[PDB]
């Protein structure tokens, strides 16, 4: 359980991301894809992208980034009581898209790296710790649903 102060830190910085959801989304997906090339293969839509310049030039990649960050935003703003938002996403990711939990760990790392690049002054160590806790709780809850559905 995050404290109310921890949730404040998380949502304070999230409100900043929301100034440019598209840019954040591109930066996060590109970081994910470059740091963890196996992740790019899960996306039929994007596996044609072979360079960072091509990734940055993809309007469709930017669209998916906005989709994913907008869903994450909705979950964060539920502060832990996120079960209705999280449940559909766990299902689709386990059953349809077939994303390992470990990939969700890589995605969290990419989020944190970006947030630190774009918001140093609203993302010091306390806010980093808080965000990490939030993203861990997300992954914990996703994992529990994965276990229920038999996804490994
Ligand atoms: C913060 C973590 C994540 C969020 C919030 C998120 C959110 C979303 C949302 C909202 C969609 C569209 C609705 C759906 O199908 O459920 C989606 C689709 C998708 N997600 Fe994620 N996702 C996350 C992590 C990942 C990761 C780590 C991968 C792959 C490594 C992944 C692969 C996909 C794919 C393949 C689709 C289908 C997109 C398409 O081909 O049209 N997701 N995700």
From Swiss-Prot:
PROSITE patterns: GLOBIN (PS01033). GO terms for biological process: removal of superoxide radicals. The modification Phosphothreonine is found at residue 67. O2 binds at residue 64. Heme b binds at residue 93. It is found in: Cytoplasm, Sarcoplasm. The keyword Membrane does not apply. Residues 1-147 form the Globin domain. Coiled coil: none annotated. Nitrite binds at residue 64. The keyword Phosphoprotein applies. Its EC number is 1.7.-.-, 1.11.1.-. The modification Phosphoserine is found at residue 3. InterPro entries: Globin (IPR000971), Globin-like_sf (IPR009050), Myoglobin (IPR002335). One of its GO terms (molecular function) is oxygen binding. One of its GO terms (cellular component) is sarcoplasm. Keywords: Cytoplasm, Heme, Iron, Metal-binding, Muscle protein, Oxidoreductase, Oxygen transport, Phosphoprotein, Transport. It catalyses: Fe(III)-heme b-[protein] + nitric oxide + H2O = Fe(II)-heme b-[protein] + nitrite + 2 H(+); H2O2 + AH2 = A + 2 H2O. PANTHER family: MYOGLOBIN. Monomeric. Monomeric heme protein which primary function is to store oxygen and facilitate its diffusion within muscle tissues. Reversibly binds oxygen through a pentacoordinated heme iron and enables its timely and efficient release as needed during periods of heightened demand. Depending on the oxidative conditions of tissues and cells, and in addition to its ability to bind oxygen, it also has a nitrite reductase activity whereby it regulates the production of bioactive nitric oxide. Belongs to the globin family. This is Myoglobin. It comes from Physeter macrocephalus. The lineage of its organism: Eukaryota, Metazoa, Chordata, Craniata, Vertebrata.
């Amino acid at each position: 359980v995050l404290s109310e102060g921890e949730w404040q830190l998380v949502l304070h910085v999230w409100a900043k991301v929301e100034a440019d959801v598209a840019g954040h989304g591109q930066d996060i997906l590109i970081r994910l894809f470059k740091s963890h090339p196996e992740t790019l293969e899960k996306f039929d839509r994007f596996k044609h992208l072979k360079t960072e310049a091509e990734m940055k030039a993809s309007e469709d990649l930017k669209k998916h980034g906005v989709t994913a960050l907008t869903a994450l935003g909705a979950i964060l703003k539920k502060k832990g009581h996120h079960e209705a938002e999280l449940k559909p996403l766990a299902q689709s990711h386990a059953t349809k898209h077939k994303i390992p939990i470990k990939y969700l760990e890589f995605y969290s790392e990419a989020i944190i790296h970006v947030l630190h690049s774009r918001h140093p002054g609203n993302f010091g160590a306390d806010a980093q710790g808080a965000m990490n806790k939030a993203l861990e709780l997300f992954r914990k809850d996703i994992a529990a649903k994965y276990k229920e559905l038999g996804y490994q």
